[PDB]
């Protein structure tokens, strides 16, 4: 029972309601605790510090803190701003860093102690192109909300010079309701293949709009790049005869996957949901799944590195951790079945470029698989 701690960082409600990532992480540590098949001779505790959103200095101090007690590695906050702080901390003091949310890849950041289980945007976007190419649409239209969606689709944006197409680009304005006039001009625009890069919450806040202006008829077809396509409040709209298509690395075929899903669903509406928002209560989200998997890959590596030690280091003792060399390499080289399927780490840019994707579509009944 080798004791170990994992740094926990959560940009959260800063209030009573507890966030999903903390939940899945603790769910994860419990999962370790019950099944000893992984780590028969080892059990890992954890320290979970909590910070504010888009607030670097506070995160950095907390980073020094979870250094003070010592762990193997941190779990990155889910927003890039302080994420950069975290990363420039980790590789600065040698402790491997694991990230879940996509960050803006800085082209020349020579950091080396980081990976990201998130489906890297490039592969996703390439699949997007293959998909739209199959459906033989021409006047496609993107709508994002903030800046980084364009980046997520850059591979999409560069397509026209090789592929005969067109696409205007339209913006959801600052607040969600503001999208009604956008739908107005799109109605004027008559753009019948509009792909969306947007947070599924905003997807909900705009589907009410689209049905409200009656735009959802059988001609229109939308494809939603987001990965929590599962928990959409699908039921009323599927009888608008519309066509939707999307992806889900979130496997459901494994019965173990299911069983863990219902265990979650017991612990999940345990947290008070927002049914008024129009989200299907009782379904764990893609990010939380990712960060569940991440502890498991950490474990599936560490079990083979019992030489693990926890140097109680300080931010000002600039000499890095003693054992960040082989352990990080192990994570890079490890493979596992998480809750998304196959999992590995591309050794080229220290990221992930490999996974398995089921494309899913809105059938007459709801989300039903339409390929791999």
Ligand X SMILES: *[C@H]1O[C@H](CO)[C@@H](O[C@H]2O[C@H](CO)[C@@H](O[C@@H]3O[C@H](CO)[C@@H](O)[C@H](O)[C@@H]3O)[C@H](O)[C@H]2NC(C)=O)[C@H](O)[C@H]1NC(C)=O
Q: Where on the chain is the footprint of ligand NAG (CB under 6 A)?
A: 218-219, 221, 243
List, edge to edge, every strand of the sheet that includes 97-99: 47-51, 7-11, 74-75, 97-99, 114-116
| Least Å from the CB of residue 208 to its own copies | 23
Rounded to an integer, what distance in angstroms lies between the CA atom of residue 172 and that of residue 199?
Answer: 12
Establish if 259 lies at the interface with ligand X (CB under 6 A). Answer: no
| Least Å from the CB of residue 357 to its own copies | 23
Cα-based angle 112, 117, 119 (whole degrees, multiple of 5): 115
Establish if 126 lies at the interface with ligand X (CB under 6 A). Answer: yes
Establish if 270 lies at the interface with ligand X (CB under 6 A). Answer: no
**Among residues 218 and 253, whose Cβ is nearest to ligand NAG?**
218
**Among residues 73 and 194, whose Cβ is nearest to ligand NAG?**
194
- 111-135: b or e for each residue (b if 16 or more CB lie within 10 Å)? eebbbbbbbbbebbbebbbebbeee
Q: Which does 213 bind (CB under 5 to 8 A by kind): ligand NAG, ligand X, its own copies, none?
A: none
Among 252, 303, 346, 361, binds ligand X (CB under 6 A): 346
Among 48, 49, 64, 189, binds its own copies (CB under 8 A): 189
Q: Give the Å distances, CA to CA, from 69 to 74, 99, 105, 142.
A: 12, 20, 29, 46
Cα dihedral across residues 333, 338, 342, 343: positive or negative = negative
Establish if 104 lies at the interface with its own copies (CB under 8 A). Answer: yes
For residue 140, the cross-strand partners are 167, 193
Establish if 221 lies at the interface with its own copies (CB under 8 A). Answer: no
Of 51-59, 251-259, 267-275, 306-314, which part binds its own copies (CB under 8 A)?
51-59
* 359 contacts 245 by C-beta, under 8 angstroms: yes
**Among residues 145 and 191, whose Cβ is nearest to ligand X?**
145
Establish if 347 lies at the interface with ligand X (CB under 6 A). Answer: yes
Q: Which does 92 bind (CB under 5 to 8 A by kind): ligand NAG, its own copies, ligand X, none?
A: its own copies
| Least Å from the CB of residue 91 to its own copies | 8
**Among residues 105 and 240, whose Cβ is nearest to ligand X?**
105
Q: Which does 73 bind (CB under 5 to 8 A by kind): ligand NAG, its own copies, ligand X, none?
A: none
Rounded to an integer, what distance in angstroms lies between the CA atom of residue 313 and that of residue 94?
Answer: 10
């Amino acid at each position: 029972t080798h004791v170990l701690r994992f740094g926990g960082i959560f940009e959260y409600v800063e209030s009573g309601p507890m966030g999903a990532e903390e939940l899945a992480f603790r769910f994860a540590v419990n999962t370790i605790n019950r099944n000893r098949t992984l780590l028969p001779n080892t059990t890992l505790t954890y320290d979970t510090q909590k910070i504010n959103l888009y607030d670097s200095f506070e995160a950095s101090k907390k980073a020094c803190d979870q250094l003070s007690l010592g762990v193997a590695a941190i779990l990155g906050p889910s927003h890039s701003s302080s994420a950069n702080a975290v990363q420039s901390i980790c590789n600065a003091l040698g402790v491997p860093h694991i990230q879940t949310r996509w960050k803006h890849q800085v082209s020349d950041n020579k950091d080396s102690f980081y990976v990201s289980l998130y489906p890297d945007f490039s592969s996703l976007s390439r699949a997007i192109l293959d998909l739209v190419q199959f459906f033989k649409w021409k006047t496609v239209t993107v709508v994002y909300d903030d800046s980084t969606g364009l980046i997520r689709l850059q591979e999409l944006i560069k397509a026209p010079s090789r592929y005969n197409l067109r696409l205007k680009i339209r913006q959801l304005p600052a607040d969600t309701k503001d999208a009604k006039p956008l739908l107005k001009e799109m109605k004027r625009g008559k753009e019948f293949h509009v792909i969306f890069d947007c947070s599924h919450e905003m997807a909900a806040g705009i589907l009410k709009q689209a049905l409200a202006m009656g735009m959802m008829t059988e001609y229109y077809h939308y494809i939603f790049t987001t990965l929590d396509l599962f928990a959409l409040d699908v039921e009323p709209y599927r009888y608008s005869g519309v066509n939707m298509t999307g992806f889900r690395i979130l496997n459901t075929e494994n019965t173990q996957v299911s069983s863990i899903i219902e265990k979650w669903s017991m612990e999940r509406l345990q947290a008070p949901p927002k049914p008024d928002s129009g989200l299907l209560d009782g379904f764990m989200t893609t990010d939380a799944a990712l960060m569940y998997d991440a502890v498991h890959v950490v474990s599936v590596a560490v079990q083979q590195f019992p030489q693990m030690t926890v140097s109680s280091l300080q931010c000002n003792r600039h000499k890095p951790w003693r054992f960040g060399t082989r352990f990080m390499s192990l994570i890079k080289e490890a493979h596992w079945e998480g809750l998304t399927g196959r999992i590995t780490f591309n050794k080229t840019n220290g990221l992930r470029t490999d996974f398995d994707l089921d494309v899913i579509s809105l059938k007459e009944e709801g989300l039903e698989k339409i390929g791999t």
